[PDB]
Short mmCIF file of C-alpha atoms in Angstrom, two decimals:
data_model
loop_
_atom_site.label_atom_id
_atom_site.label_comp_id
_atom_site.label_asym_id
_atom_site.label_seq_id
_atom_site.Cartn_x
_atom_site.Cartn_y
_atom_site.Cartn_z
CA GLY A 1 -36.92 -13.14 -9.20
CA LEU A 2 -33.35 -13.07 -7.66
CA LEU A 3 -30.21 -11.90 -9.05
CA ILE A 4 -26.36 -12.27 -8.28
CA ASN A 5 -24.82 -9.25 -10.40
CA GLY A 6 -22.91 -6.53 -9.94
CA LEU A 7 -20.15 -8.43 -7.91
CA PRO A 8 -17.55 -6.07 -6.21
CA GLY A 9 -14.36 -7.10 -8.14
CA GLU A 10 -11.95 -7.66 -5.41
CA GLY A 11 -14.28 -10.98 -4.50
CA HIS A 12 -14.46 -11.67 -8.19
CA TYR A 13 -12.24 -14.99 -8.02
CA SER A 14 -15.04 -16.57 -5.96
CA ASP A 15 -17.60 -15.55 -8.56
CA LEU A 16 -15.04 -16.81 -11.16
CA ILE A 17 -15.21 -20.39 -9.24
CA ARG A 18 -18.79 -20.26 -8.84
CA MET A 19 -19.24 -19.68 -12.62
CA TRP A 20 -16.80 -22.68 -13.28
CA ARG A 21 -18.19 -25.01 -10.80
CA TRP A 22 -22.42 -24.55 -11.52
CA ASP A 23 -21.39 -24.50 -15.39
CA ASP A 24 -19.34 -27.55 -15.10
CA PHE A 25 -22.76 -29.16 -13.02
CA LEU A 26 -25.08 -27.81 -15.82
CA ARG A 27 -24.07 -30.81 -18.43
CA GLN A 28 -27.25 -33.18 -17.35
CA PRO A 29 -29.20 -32.06 -14.02
CA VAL A 30 -29.42 -35.49 -12.96
CA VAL A 31 -30.32 -36.77 -9.12
CA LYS A 32 -28.85 -40.45 -7.80
CA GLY A 33 -32.11 -40.19 -5.17
CA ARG A 34 -34.03 -37.97 -3.02
CA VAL A 35 -32.42 -37.64 0.67
CA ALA A 36 -33.73 -36.24 3.73
CA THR A 37 -30.33 -35.94 4.94
CA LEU A 38 -27.12 -34.73 3.68
CA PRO A 39 -24.89 -38.10 3.20
CA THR A 40 -22.22 -38.09 5.82
CA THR A 41 -20.36 -40.70 3.79
CA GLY A 42 -19.78 -42.63 0.60
CA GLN A 43 -20.13 -39.15 -1.45
CA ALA A 44 -17.86 -37.81 -4.38
CA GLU A 45 -17.94 -35.46 -7.18
CA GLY A 46 -20.84 -36.42 -9.67
CA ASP A 47 -22.84 -37.27 -6.84
CA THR A 48 -26.23 -35.38 -6.45
CA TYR A 49 -28.90 -36.18 -3.90
CA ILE A 50 -32.22 -33.71 -3.42
CA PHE A 51 -31.60 -32.66 0.26
CA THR A 52 -35.50 -32.59 0.99
CA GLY A 53 -34.97 -32.68 5.33
CA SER A 54 -37.18 -30.80 7.10
CA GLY A 55 -36.44 -27.04 7.38
CA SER B 1 4.38 36.60 -4.14
CA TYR B 2 7.82 36.77 -3.32
CA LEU B 3 11.09 36.15 -5.59
CA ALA B 4 14.00 34.18 -4.85
CA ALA B 5 17.15 33.28 -6.54
CA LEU B 6 19.80 30.49 -6.35
CA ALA B 7 23.49 30.65 -7.74
CA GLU B 8 26.83 28.34 -7.64
CA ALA B 9 30.02 30.00 -7.01
CA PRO B 10 31.99 29.70 -10.29
CA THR B 11 35.27 29.99 -8.65
CA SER B 12 36.74 29.57 -4.90
CA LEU B 13 37.79 33.21 -5.09
CA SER B 14 34.43 34.51 -5.43
CA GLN B 15 32.70 35.16 -2.13
CA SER B 16 28.82 36.43 -2.67
CA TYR B 17 26.85 37.64 -5.50
CA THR B 18 24.55 40.84 -5.75
CA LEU B 19 21.04 40.62 -6.65
CA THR B 20 19.66 42.83 -9.57
CA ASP B 21 16.11 42.87 -10.70
CA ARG B 22 13.53 45.18 -12.43
CA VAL B 23 10.18 45.06 -13.26
CA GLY B 24 9.06 43.79 -16.89
CA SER B 25 11.37 44.54 -19.68
CA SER B 26 12.17 48.17 -19.44
CA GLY B 27 13.64 50.33 -16.47
CA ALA B 28 16.55 50.31 -14.34
CA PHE B 29 17.71 47.59 -12.20
CA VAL B 30 17.67 48.40 -8.19
CA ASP B 31 20.16 46.73 -6.05
CA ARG B 32 18.18 44.22 -3.65
CA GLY B 33 21.24 42.64 -1.85
CA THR B 34 23.47 39.93 -1.76
CA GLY B 35 23.32 36.09 -1.00
CA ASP B 36 25.54 33.18 -0.32
CA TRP B 37 26.07 30.07 -2.76
CA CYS B 38 23.56 27.43 -2.78
CA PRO B 39 25.18 23.76 -2.30
CA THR B 40 23.98 21.72 -5.04
CA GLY B 41 24.59 18.26 -7.00
CA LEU B 42 23.73 16.59 -10.06
CA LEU B 43 21.54 13.04 -9.78
CA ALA B 44 23.54 10.07 -11.12
CA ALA B 45 20.48 7.94 -11.50
CA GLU B 46 16.82 9.04 -12.18
CA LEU B 47 14.44 9.18 -9.38
CA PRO B 48 11.66 7.06 -9.48
CA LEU B 49 7.84 7.91 -8.60
CA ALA B 50 7.83 6.53 -5.03
CA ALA B 51 6.67 8.25 -2.06
CA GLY B 52 8.64 8.26 1.67
CA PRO B 53 12.62 8.04 1.83
CA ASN B 54 14.60 7.58 -1.26
CA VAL B 55 18.52 6.79 -1.45
CA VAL B 56 19.91 8.50 -4.38
CA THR B 57 23.93 9.09 -5.15
CA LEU B 58 24.67 12.72 -6.21
CA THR B 59 28.00 13.80 -8.39
CA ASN B 60 29.66 16.80 -8.63
CA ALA B 61 28.42 17.91 -5.39
CA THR B 62 29.58 21.47 -4.43
CA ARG B 63 29.59 22.41 -0.75
CA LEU B 64 28.23 18.99 0.30
CA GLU B 65 29.88 19.54 3.79
CA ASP B 66 28.04 22.28 5.21
CA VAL B 67 24.52 20.35 4.12
CA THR B 68 22.56 19.69 7.31
CA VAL B 69 19.55 17.07 8.13
CA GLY B 70 16.18 18.60 8.36
CA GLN B 71 16.72 21.16 5.14
CA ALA B 72 14.53 21.97 2.45
CA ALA B 73 15.60 20.64 -1.05
CA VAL B 74 14.04 21.81 -4.27
CA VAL B 75 14.71 19.90 -7.60
CA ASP B 76 12.65 20.76 -10.67
CA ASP B 77 9.32 21.50 -9.01
CA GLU B 78 9.58 18.94 -6.31
CA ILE B 79 10.50 20.22 -2.62
CA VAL B 80 12.04 17.19 -0.41
CA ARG B 81 13.69 16.91 2.86
CA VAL B 82 16.76 15.31 3.71
CA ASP B 83 17.01 12.72 5.81
CA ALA B 84 20.52 11.19 5.97
CA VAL B 85 23.99 12.53 4.46
CA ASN B 86 27.30 10.59 3.56
CA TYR B 87 29.91 13.15 3.18
CA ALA B 88 32.55 10.99 1.66
CA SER B 89 30.35 8.88 -1.13
CA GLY B 90 27.58 11.87 -1.47
CA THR B 91 24.57 9.75 -0.70
CA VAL B 92 21.84 11.18 0.51
CA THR B 93 18.12 10.19 1.55
CA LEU B 94 15.43 12.50 0.42
CA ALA B 95 11.70 12.40 1.35
CA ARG B 96 9.49 12.87 -1.63
CA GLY B 97 6.24 14.89 -1.90
CA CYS B 98 6.66 17.50 0.79
CA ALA B 99 5.28 21.14 1.39
CA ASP B 100 3.29 22.13 -1.67
CA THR B 101 4.62 19.58 -4.26
CA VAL B 102 3.94 16.08 -5.28
CA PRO B 103 6.83 13.28 -6.73
CA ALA B 104 7.72 13.56 -10.14
CA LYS B 105 9.96 11.87 -12.56
CA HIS B 106 13.33 13.45 -12.72
CA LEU B 107 16.00 12.28 -15.20
CA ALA B 108 19.48 11.59 -14.55
CA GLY B 109 21.21 14.78 -14.36
CA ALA B 110 18.62 16.94 -12.58
CA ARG B 111 19.89 19.67 -10.55
CA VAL B 112 19.07 19.66 -6.49
CA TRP B 113 19.25 22.83 -4.83
CA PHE B 114 19.66 22.97 -0.91
CA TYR B 115 17.93 26.24 -1.10
CA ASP B 116 17.50 26.14 2.88
CA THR B 117 19.30 28.95 4.40
CA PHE B 118 21.53 29.54 1.11
CA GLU B 119 18.75 31.88 -1.05
CA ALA B 120 18.65 35.52 -1.76
CA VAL B 121 15.29 37.16 -1.26
CA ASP B 122 14.13 40.47 -2.37
CA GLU B 123 11.85 41.99 0.16
CA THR B 124 9.63 43.67 -2.15
CA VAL B 125 6.19 42.32 -2.79
CA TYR B 126 5.18 41.52 -6.36
CA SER B 127 1.55 40.81 -7.41
CA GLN B 128 1.08 37.55 -9.81
CA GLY B 129 1.09 37.47 -13.43
CA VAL B 130 4.08 40.07 -13.61
CA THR B 131 7.35 39.27 -15.33
CA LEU B 132 10.73 40.18 -14.27
CA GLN B 133 14.15 40.47 -15.45
CA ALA B 134 17.00 39.69 -13.05
CA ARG B 135 20.64 39.40 -13.01
CA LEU B 136 23.12 38.23 -10.53
CA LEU B 137 26.56 39.83 -10.40
CA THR B 138 29.60 37.75 -8.71
CA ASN B 139 31.46 39.86 -6.12
CA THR B 140 35.25 39.11 -4.97
CA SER B 141 38.12 41.05 -3.36
CA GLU B 142 39.10 42.50 -6.53
CA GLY B 143 35.55 44.07 -7.10
CA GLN B 144 32.35 43.44 -8.62
CA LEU B 145 31.42 41.72 -11.99
CA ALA B 146 30.54 44.64 -14.76
CA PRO B 147 27.01 44.19 -15.43
CA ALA B 148 27.35 43.86 -19.56
CA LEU B 149 28.78 40.39 -18.71
CA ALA B 150 26.12 39.00 -16.49
CA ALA B 151 23.38 36.48 -17.83
CA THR B 152 19.80 37.45 -18.08
CA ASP B 153 16.55 35.59 -17.04
CA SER B 154 12.90 36.06 -16.87
CA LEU B 155 10.11 34.45 -14.33
CA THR B 156 6.47 34.55 -14.32
CA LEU B 157 4.76 34.69 -10.83
CA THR B 158 2.02 32.51 -10.14
CA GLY B 159 1.05 33.20 -6.58
CA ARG B 160 2.68 30.15 -5.24
CA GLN B 161 2.00 30.95 -1.79
CA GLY B 162 -1.78 31.52 -2.24
CA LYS B 163 -2.36 28.37 -3.71
CA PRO B 164 -3.64 25.59 -1.30
CA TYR B 165 -1.48 22.69 -0.90
CA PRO B 166 -2.71 19.44 -2.60
CA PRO B 167 -3.41 16.19 -1.15
CA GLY B 168 -0.71 14.03 0.73
CA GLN B 169 -0.77 10.45 1.26
CA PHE B 170 -2.46 9.37 -2.17
CA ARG B 171 -2.89 5.61 -1.55
CA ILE B 172 -5.04 3.21 -4.16
CA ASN B 173 -6.59 0.12 -2.51
CA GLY B 174 -3.75 0.12 0.01
CA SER B 175 -0.92 0.39 -2.60
CA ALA B 176 1.10 3.64 -3.66
CA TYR B 177 0.99 4.27 -7.48
CA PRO B 178 -0.23 0.85 -8.34
CA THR B 179 -0.74 -0.56 -11.80
CA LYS B 180 -2.76 -3.25 -10.61
CA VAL B 181 -6.15 -3.28 -8.81
CA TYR B 182 -8.35 -6.29 -8.53
CA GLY B 183 -11.69 -4.65 -9.07
CA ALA B 184 -13.43 -2.30 -6.74
CA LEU B 185 -11.32 1.16 -6.89
CA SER B 186 -10.64 2.82 -3.51
CA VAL B 187 -8.75 5.88 -3.59
CA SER B 188 -7.47 7.82 -0.17
CA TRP B 189 -6.05 11.20 0.21
CA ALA B 190 -5.00 13.31 3.08
CA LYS B 191 -6.07 16.79 3.86
CA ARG B 192 -3.30 19.38 4.32
CA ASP B 193 -3.67 22.84 5.89
CA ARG B 194 -1.11 25.27 5.02
CA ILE B 195 -1.77 27.59 8.12
CA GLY B 196 -1.43 24.84 10.60
CA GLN B 197 1.89 23.50 9.12
CA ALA B 198 3.45 26.67 8.98
CA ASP B 199 7.29 26.02 8.70
CA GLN B 200 6.96 22.34 9.27
CA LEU B 201 8.01 20.13 6.28
CA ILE B 202 5.51 17.06 6.19
CA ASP B 203 5.85 14.42 3.65
CA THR B 204 3.05 12.34 1.95
CA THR B 205 3.59 9.25 4.20
CA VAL B 206 1.97 11.44 7.34
CA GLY B 207 -1.54 11.06 8.00
CA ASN B 208 -4.25 13.51 8.18
CA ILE B 209 -3.47 16.96 9.60
CA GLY B 210 -6.92 18.61 9.56
CA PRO B 211 -8.65 20.54 6.62
CA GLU B 212 -8.09 24.32 5.86
CA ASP B 213 -10.91 26.93 6.43
CA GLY B 214 -12.81 26.59 3.30
CA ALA B 215 -10.71 24.29 1.32
CA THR B 216 -12.31 21.04 -0.39
CA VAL B 217 -11.20 18.63 -2.70
CA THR B 218 -11.91 18.09 -6.34
CA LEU B 219 -11.17 14.74 -8.52
CA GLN B 220 -11.62 14.47 -12.32
CA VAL B 221 -12.20 11.19 -13.91
CA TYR B 222 -11.03 10.86 -17.62
CA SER B 223 -11.16 8.15 -20.38
CA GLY B 224 -7.70 8.34 -21.11
CA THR B 225 -7.78 11.56 -23.25
CA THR B 226 -11.50 12.63 -22.69
CA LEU B 227 -13.27 13.80 -19.79
CA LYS B 228 -16.03 11.72 -18.48
CA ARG B 229 -16.92 12.49 -15.05
CA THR B 230 -16.02 15.35 -12.45
CA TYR B 231 -16.36 15.03 -8.67
CA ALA B 232 -16.03 18.54 -6.53
CA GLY B 233 -16.27 19.37 -3.09
CA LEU B 234 -15.42 16.10 -1.85
CA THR B 235 -14.55 16.55 1.87
CA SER B 236 -14.01 12.97 3.21
CA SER B 237 -10.49 11.00 2.83
CA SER B 238 -11.97 8.40 0.13
CA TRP B 239 -13.58 8.16 -2.61
CA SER B 240 -15.27 4.95 -4.50
CA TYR B 241 -16.51 4.84 -8.25
CA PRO B 242 -20.40 4.76 -8.14
CA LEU B 243 -21.98 1.62 -9.71
CA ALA B 244 -24.52 3.80 -11.56
CA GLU B 245 -21.71 5.33 -13.92
CA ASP B 246 -19.86 1.95 -14.39
CA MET B 247 -22.40 0.61 -16.71
CA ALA B 248 -22.56 3.99 -18.43
CA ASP B 249 -19.31 4.27 -18.96
CA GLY B 250 -18.33 0.48 -19.36
CA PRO B 251 -15.18 -1.22 -18.44
CA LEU B 252 -12.17 1.56 -18.45
CA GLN B 253 -9.21 -0.55 -18.41
CA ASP B 254 -7.03 2.75 -18.90
CA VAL B 255 -8.29 5.27 -16.18
CA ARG B 256 -6.53 8.38 -15.46
CA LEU B 257 -6.64 9.73 -11.98
CA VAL B 258 -6.35 13.55 -11.48
CA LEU B 259 -6.33 14.81 -7.94
CA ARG B 260 -6.16 18.56 -6.58
CA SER B 261 -7.31 20.54 -3.92
CA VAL B 262 -9.40 23.79 -4.57
CA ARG B 263 -10.58 26.75 -2.47
CA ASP B 264 -12.83 29.52 -3.86
CA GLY B 265 -11.92 28.35 -7.31
CA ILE B 266 -8.06 28.71 -6.64
CA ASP B 267 -6.67 25.39 -7.81
CA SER B 268 -3.31 23.89 -6.43
CA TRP B 269 -0.12 24.70 -8.61
CA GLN B 270 0.66 21.04 -8.73
CA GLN B 271 -1.69 17.98 -8.96
CA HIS B 272 -1.36 14.25 -9.21
CA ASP B 273 -1.84 12.43 -12.53
CA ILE B 274 -1.35 8.61 -13.08
CA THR B 275 -2.99 6.16 -15.71
CA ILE B 276 -3.82 2.97 -13.92
CA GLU B 277 -4.47 -0.63 -15.19
CA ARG B 278 -7.47 -2.38 -13.90
CA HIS B 279 -7.81 -6.39 -13.37
CA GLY B 280 -10.45 -8.73 -11.96
CA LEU B 281 -13.60 -9.87 -13.53
CA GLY B 282 -14.57 -8.51 -16.65
CA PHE B 283 -11.30 -6.64 -17.28
CA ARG B 284 -8.61 -7.78 -19.39
CA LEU B 285 -9.63 -11.33 -20.31
CA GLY B 286 -8.13 -11.28 -23.80
CA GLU B 287 -5.54 -13.16 -21.49
CA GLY C 1 -25.39 -20.61 -36.05
CA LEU C 2 -23.92 -17.59 -34.05
CA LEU C 3 -21.05 -16.91 -31.52
CA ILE C 4 -20.13 -14.27 -29.08
CA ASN C 5 -16.23 -15.03 -29.30
CA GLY C 6 -14.75 -12.27 -31.54
CA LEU C 7 -14.14 -9.47 -29.14
CA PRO C 8 -11.42 -7.58 -27.30
CA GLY C 9 -10.23 -7.72 -23.81
CA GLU C 10 -11.27 -4.06 -23.70
CA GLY C 11 -15.19 -3.88 -23.33
CA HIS C 12 -16.19 -7.62 -22.07
CA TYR C 13 -17.17 -6.18 -18.65
CA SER C 14 -20.66 -6.19 -20.46
CA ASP C 15 -20.23 -9.58 -21.67
CA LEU C 16 -19.54 -10.99 -18.21
CA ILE C 17 -22.32 -9.06 -16.70
CA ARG C 18 -24.14 -10.79 -19.36
CA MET C 19 -22.93 -14.42 -18.29
CA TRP C 20 -24.10 -13.67 -14.73
CA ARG C 21 -27.41 -12.52 -16.13
CA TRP C 22 -27.98 -15.28 -18.50
CA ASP C 23 -26.73 -18.24 -16.87
CA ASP C 24 -28.59 -17.02 -13.34
CA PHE C 25 -31.68 -16.57 -15.73
CA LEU C 26 -31.65 -20.29 -17.56
CA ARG C 27 -31.98 -21.73 -13.77
CA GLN C 28 -35.38 -22.51 -15.35
CA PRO C 29 -36.75 -21.20 -18.88
CA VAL C 30 -40.07 -20.16 -17.94
CA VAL C 31 -42.39 -17.29 -19.33
CA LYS C 32 -45.13 -15.83 -17.07
CA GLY C 33 -47.00 -15.58 -20.43
CA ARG C 34 -46.61 -14.34 -24.26
CA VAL C 35 -46.95 -10.63 -24.73
CA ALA C 36 -47.27 -8.71 -28.03
CA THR C 37 -46.02 -5.45 -26.35
CA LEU C 38 -43.37 -5.18 -23.80
CA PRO C 39 -44.96 -4.48 -20.36
CA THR C 40 -44.60 -0.88 -19.39
CA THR C 41 -45.38 -1.22 -15.93
CA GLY C 42 -45.38 -3.63 -13.29
CA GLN C 43 -42.45 -5.49 -14.18
CA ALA C 44 -39.07 -6.47 -12.13
CA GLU C 45 -36.75 -8.95 -11.82
CA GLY C 46 -37.94 -12.49 -12.53
CA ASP C 47 -40.63 -11.46 -15.02
CA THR C 48 -40.29 -13.20 -18.20
CA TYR C 49 -42.76 -12.34 -21.02
CA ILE C 50 -42.58 -13.60 -24.65
CA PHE C 51 -42.56 -10.44 -26.69
CA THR C 52 -44.47 -11.85 -29.54
CA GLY C 53 -45.26 -8.16 -31.09
CA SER C 54 -45.30 -7.94 -34.82
CA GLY C 55 -42.03 -7.23 -36.33
CA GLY D 1 -18.21 -36.90 -12.00
CA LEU D 2 -15.87 -34.67 -13.24
CA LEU D 3 -14.40 -30.99 -12.89
CA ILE D 4 -12.83 -28.18 -14.68
CA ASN D 5 -12.05 -26.22 -11.43
CA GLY D 6 -9.26 -24.67 -10.21
CA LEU D 7 -6.75 -23.96 -13.19
CA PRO D 8 -3.57 -21.93 -12.83
CA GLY D 9 -4.88 -18.10 -13.29
CA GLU D 10 -2.16 -17.76 -16.07
CA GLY D 11 -4.01 -19.81 -18.36
CA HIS D 12 -7.50 -18.79 -17.62
CA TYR D 13 -7.95 -17.09 -20.71
CA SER D 14 -8.16 -20.49 -22.67
CA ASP D 15 -11.06 -21.98 -20.20
CA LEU D 16 -12.83 -18.66 -20.41
CA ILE D 17 -13.13 -18.88 -24.14
CA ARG D 18 -13.56 -22.53 -23.66
CA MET D 19 -17.08 -21.40 -21.24
CA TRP D 20 -17.63 -18.88 -23.55
CA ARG D 21 -18.18 -21.06 -26.43
CA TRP D 22 -19.97 -23.94 -24.64
CA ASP D 23 -22.61 -21.13 -23.02
CA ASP D 24 -23.15 -19.71 -26.36
CA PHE D 25 -24.03 -23.20 -27.61
CA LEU D 26 -26.09 -24.05 -24.86
CA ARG D 27 -29.18 -21.86 -26.09
CA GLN D 28 -30.67 -25.16 -27.57
CA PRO D 29 -29.13 -28.48 -27.81
CA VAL D 30 -29.81 -29.45 -31.17
CA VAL D 31 -27.85 -31.91 -33.67
CA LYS D 32 -28.58 -31.86 -37.19
CA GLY D 33 -28.03 -35.84 -37.24
CA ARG D 34 -25.94 -38.66 -36.22
CA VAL D 35 -22.63 -39.00 -38.15
CA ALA D 36 -20.29 -41.87 -37.68
CA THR D 37 -17.50 -39.81 -39.27
CA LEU D 38 -16.73 -36.00 -38.83
CA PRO D 39 -17.92 -34.08 -41.81
CA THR D 40 -14.68 -33.14 -43.48
CA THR D 41 -16.81 -30.70 -46.14
CA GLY D 42 -19.74 -28.49 -45.85
CA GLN D 43 -19.67 -27.44 -42.28
CA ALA D 44 -19.78 -24.19 -40.52
CA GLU D 45 -20.99 -22.45 -37.14
CA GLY D 46 -24.21 -23.98 -35.73
CA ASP D 47 -23.68 -27.40 -37.25
CA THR D 48 -23.78 -30.19 -34.97
CA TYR D 49 -23.37 -33.61 -35.44
CA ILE D 50 -23.45 -36.95 -33.11
CA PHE D 51 -20.05 -38.32 -33.91
CA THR D 52 -20.70 -42.20 -32.96
CA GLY D 53 -18.02 -43.52 -35.11
CA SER D 54 -16.28 -46.68 -34.01
CA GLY D 55 -14.12 -45.78 -31.18
#
């Protein structure tokens, strides 16, 4: 149980960008592959890798 | 309460005028003294609601030469301070929201009185709520005006000196009288003590000058026409709308803010009142 | 078929509250269990029960 | 990879109504059937057909 409600409307634009980007990502939850480290190169929009690096 | 009168010379051959007044609508007028003519002028353009110095041009100005910087000028129901004077062009700079007054709209043609050092005062003390009838009689080297030709007027006392001064610097989210606020509502007010100020004229732009013994701040929250929330006993210099009532009242696109100072149930004669428009997430997304 | 389009720009703060609630809640549509009555106690954020009471 | 981010705030109303409609539709991604042509008649809210016409 976690929550993001009641944003002070001063920082409302950041939350608006959040609603834009996450909603855009929600078309299909697909991962190109599991990775133990963040790909430092060769990544762009539409690339989703499961970051399972120790931590 | 005390009574004062101001007048303009009808002719250059008039030296001064006599003050005559009586209590109520019955009785015999008792001479109270004489006073000089008060310099005055007419505003050529409207004076917008804005704190701090403002440049205004005057038309039909009289005795503009004798005006001095630092004097107290009263127009309609606002007391302002003169910062600069231009004899030739009749342009002066006025400090808005000074003494126990707040800025208000003044349409073109409003009369400005520089009553400082040019007012006739009746030394008798009168209690609040009493209605007076007074007349001004012109005086010339040829004699005095016959009372039958003198105009009559009435005034209702309201204990102006008794009431506490209203809050000063009224800034919302860092802006003065803004019509645009992005989400969170922050209102800042200044604390004014009449005793400490004494004869000094302090405008709204100045900061806190300390509170008055037994004086607090009260705020009323309206829904445009209806009263929804009322916060009293405020002692801080800022207030924020609690998140608890935001859902109950929901979004309030049109919010009316009313600010005043109250001590022992004595409300200030004047107050602030503006209807502001809110913007941000969840406010005005029809466009 | 239903929609939540038609509404003025005045009372839509509740609509966006619901947009912050539903979207975040839909991270994973999981129900802790089916209930024929609303749990009157011991519930908080993150608790979802299928209210399947008669009616 | 695609995005709908960073629009000029002036026209945010159109894309907000957009995301509103899409969020409303996301309750259940159901298609009444597959169609090679857009149904020209007998359709209303809640009717979803997969337009798989040539093109």
